[PDB]
Structure formats: structure tokens, C-alpha cells
């Protein structure tokens, strides 16, 4: 009937992540929901260090080639993810040949060197890059990361990525992403971090919150306090990897690390607790996750002068990176679309809230 | 209205006592060891960690205290823990020069350890937990420190018994563990009973630690776990009692760092993992007295098959429950709280020996 890109046509780009099997074709059923439903594209995996330059090298393009190519017969608005990240990311890139650690110029030469193979190898293709991923801590300082430690200063490792990113990519536009953004601490140590690329005179042009929430986090207060932080720099704001979990425990708030894949979560008084909803999600659940994607879309509808773009991470539940993390073999309802391909009472609920006038 | 008096016919009922009440810091709690039990099991100060820090370097002063404190009010002394993968010391198993010990070595510091320990107090220790946590959830041998270096599972087992049993005849041999409730792991410790049994070596009884909490675990299967140690001829206990009512661990016990994580301390979490900082809602302590209530009915119905029940501290704050697993947490999962006074659990337990 109405599709998602229509229905916010005149607010944002509504995207989607997209795997390797939406774009091979043998997840067809989601590939049919991408063209109906979506004018922007995630690669959710293929387009990582790791994928991209698995050994000290080594290339392999072929899946991210496969992506972009998929990208242009729907007239895709293209999204790279992700140049500059601590995870996956092999160790060979903080290493130099002998394995001893790379100094900092040599850090900063693989960096330039990974991005100008990456970013460089689709012009005018991609549209938009993550250029640097997850760095700012929940406290607002830097995260000492792999790449914080060999290249020495967090605001240097910043500074060059979006460096070497407008230079071999001078048409696309430059993305920071990072989860828990709606957190004023962590927020406000991203703005101090835009502020700083600004004045040193490097390009950013919007900053990407990734909306990995809950039924019980966070609050519209906060999101709406950091759109508007972010606004007020003059950058795009953008909901980049949107997903609403709602089993026990992980509804709470976002975890990381991988305390959770502990073998003892797979234990019987576990996983009766953790993995509730294993026939499908209960009337009331469902509504209260209906209930939830709606007052959020209510919120970015509202902000939807400040916002560009508002990505869920996929398409079908079945296929959500939320089944297995942070605890493996779960079953979770993250998204719009069921296992069977069908649109959860909370898409008809998302596709009427531009209809309020 | 005392514990003991309470529960005399059926089984001794004690508690764990810490460093704070031996030295007589904590005279409130003190006082209503005297008062409410007539067992104690040191805390921590008998821990290989504590009684030998560094290579060939002893500690027994605080292990002393609690000996001595024991017998000021003559009370069934436990001396926890000889041989356990957690909290001792990396030097157990390398040598000087920092190499992995060799089975031989391995057992020669199984022996010499417990030499000093068990043979120390002969006469003054009524009974001995010789190994603890040693069966995985499953069944098998965790693939533990003690485990590798001896190089196979039974070899630790019958050893450290052995040695217990030479070191200390006077005293009992029990082994002790969490989790003994689970049908997997119950005839796990069921079949390392019958193995030392066959080898003629001492053990008098199986103690399940009865960490447990609001949701878990079944009566039928804390039920079947005593009737089947009890069947091996052996004294079964539990020694660590205590009943968890905070989000998440009320579901089912928890080991390893994973909760420590910075994370958990964020606010998100601390609002929904911490929620009775301003004490214990009327309700959920109902909960808690009916849970103490039903596990006491079901100890003092099986009475003839178990020697001794524990719980795991006296006063609320004491307990390692608070910071475990998530530090700076307010837990409440024992009898009395952090006043000192009875909890509505207390009363129940006490009420269960005279009831129809």
C-alpha cells in the first residue's frame, strides 16, 4: 500500500543494514522488502577492515563490490562502514612486518592506506562513510584503543581519518558513529570532539547516533537533548543502526564485551529467563514494542528538520544480530518485519506517524 | 526461638564467621553467633591464598583466631577449603624457576599444603571441606588448575582425601560445591563418591553449597540431590546458605567477572540490577520469608539424611552478595539485617520444627 521511504519522503532517508545473502539473492524475500521499502543502504558486515584486509596484504573486495553493485539498481543512497574501528579489525594493521607494534607514523600510514584502497575504490558510488567508529567513552574521554595507543593521542587518530577520508573521498560525505550518543556525558565528549575537527578545519558532516535501544531505554528526553546538541554544529544528525530489543535483562540497556556468551547463560534457570518468547512474542509484548518504535519515529518526525537519515539494523527479525548477542542461541524481535517476511503491527504504527498532521 | 535449640533433633545449624567477628570488631553479629548456632565455617582466613601468600611463605595468625574463637563457645568447627581451583596463589603450580609443575610436583605441594593446614589443627577441626568445586555443570571434571597439573581428575580427588586422611584422622572429609541441585551435575559427584569409596579412602559427606535465590532451584530437585547423596552411606549438608533477591542472580548463580564489568555500574543498569537501596519492599520480603520458610520445611522433612545446614554470614551487610556478583549492590539474602534484628525469615525458619 504505502511504503516507508514515501511515508517519511519529505522528513529523512529510511535505510536499512543489508548482509551478504540480501545482496548475493538468497535472502530474496528481504532483498523484495529493501526495494519496496528503503532508499538508503547499510553493508552490515562486508565493508569492515577485517573482510576488506583480512592479512597484511591482502585485499578482498568482492563481497563490497557485490554491495555497492546491488546499491545502484534500486538508486540506493550508499553508507560505508566502517574505516577507522578497535573491532574487527586484524592485528596485522598495529603491527609492522616483524610483528613488533607500528610507530605512530607508521599507524598513521597504514590508516592512510587502508582508507585510500577502501574510501578511494568507490567514487561517486558511496555516498556517505563511517569514517571513524565507537571512540568516545560513556564518561566523554577517549577510549584507549588499539588505534588511540599506537597512534599516541586520541584527537590526532580522529583528526587524520577524517583527514585522509576527504582526500580520497572528496564527494562523499563523513560520518562519527557511536552507540549510547543519547548519554550526556558520552555526548558531550562527541561534541567537544566535532568542535575540535571543526576548528582544526577538517570535514564532518553529520554525526551518526546508532539507536541500539530497549522497551525501557532511553529516554526521548535524552535523544531529543542530543539531537539538538548535535544540530546546533551544524552537522546531519542520523539513527544509523535502530533496533528495539525487547528480551529480558538486554531491554534494560546496551551491553558490550562478551561477559554474556559465558556457558553458563545457556543453563536451563537461564535460559528460561533470558530466552522467554522462543513461540512467538506475546499480545502485550508485541504491543508495547509497537508502541515503542512508534513514539520514537514520533520523536525523530518531530526533529525531522535536524535529522538526514534513520537506518534500522535489517530487515526480518531472523536475521538480527540481536538473536546471538550478547547471549548466544536467543530469541529476540528487534525490527519491523517477522521471521515469515510480514510487517509487525509496529511498521503499520512507524508508516502512519508522518500521517499526523 | 534460638536457631539451634530449634533444630536440635534434626541437624546442626551454623553460619560462616569473618575476620570482623573473631577479633570481636563485630560484637553485634558476634553476640548472635553465641545466641542462634552452635557451627562456624572461616569466611576466607583458612584459604590457600591466605594461609600461604607467596613461595614458601605461611600465614596463620587470622586461621588461628578463628580456632580459638571457636572453642571459646564450643562449636562444630569447618575448616573451609584445602584443595580449590579459586583463591590460591599462581605458585602452587610452577616451581622457582617458574615452570609448569609435573604431576609429581603438583601432588607433592597437594601434600605439603595440606600437612600444614589439616595437621595444624588436629583435635581443634571437627571436620574438613578436602575438595571443593572440582565437577563441571555437566557432569565432568572442570579443567581446573589442580586438574592439568596432576593430569587427571580422580588422581586429585583421591589424593587430597588421602592426604586428609593421614594428616587428620580425627577430623571429617567432606566435599563441597554450587550447583549440586542440577541432575547433570549431581550424579557427576555421585559417581567421584562411589570412585573413592572403591578406593577405600575417607569421605563422610557431600555439601551443597545452596547459594540459591528466589527463583531457583526446584524442591524436587534439591530433594533428589540429598536422597541421592544420602544413598552413598555419606552425611549430607548445606554449608553456604543463602537466598539471592535482586534482579537477574534470583534467577540462577552466577561465577566469573562477567558482572564486574564497568558497564553494569552505569545508570541504565544500576536501576534496574539495584532496586531496593532504600530496603526491602514489603512484598518481595514475603517472598523471601515463604522461600526460607518452604527450604527449611523441606531440610527439617529430611532431617534424617542431613547433618549440618550453614548459612552463608549472619547480618544482611556481611554478605558477599552485595558486591557479588555486581559490585555495590544492596542485596538482603540472609536471616538477619543490617540492624542486626530478626527478619520475618528468621521467624519462619524458627516455627518450622513445631509445625503441623
Known sequence: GTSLKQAYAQGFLLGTAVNADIVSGKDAA?????????????????????????????????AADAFVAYAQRDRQFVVGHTLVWHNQTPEWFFTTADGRPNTPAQQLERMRAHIAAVAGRYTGKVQAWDVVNEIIDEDGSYRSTNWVQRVGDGDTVVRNAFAFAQRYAPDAQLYYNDFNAWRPAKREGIVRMVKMLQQAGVRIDGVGMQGHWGLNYPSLRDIEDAI???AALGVK??????????????????????????????????????????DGLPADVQAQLRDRYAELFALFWRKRDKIARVSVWGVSDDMSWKNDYPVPGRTNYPLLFDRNHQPKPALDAVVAVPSAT
Open 228 to 230: 539538538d546538541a548535535y
Open 30 to 62: 528481504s532483498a523484495a522488502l529493501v526495494a519496496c521499502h528503503f532508499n538508503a543502504v547499510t553493508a552490515e558486515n562486508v565493508m569492515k577492515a577485517e573482510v576488506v584486509a583480512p592479512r597484511r596484504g591482502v585485499q578482498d573486495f568482492s
Open 237 to 278: 544528525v542520523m539513527i544509523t543502526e535502530l533496533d528495539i530489543d525487547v528480551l529480558p535483562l538486554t531491554k534494560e540497556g546496551q551491553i558490550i564485551g562478551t561477559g554474556m556468551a559465558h556457558k553458563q547463560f545457556q543453563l536451563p534457570e537461564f535460559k528460561r529467563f533470558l530466552d522467554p518468547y522462543r
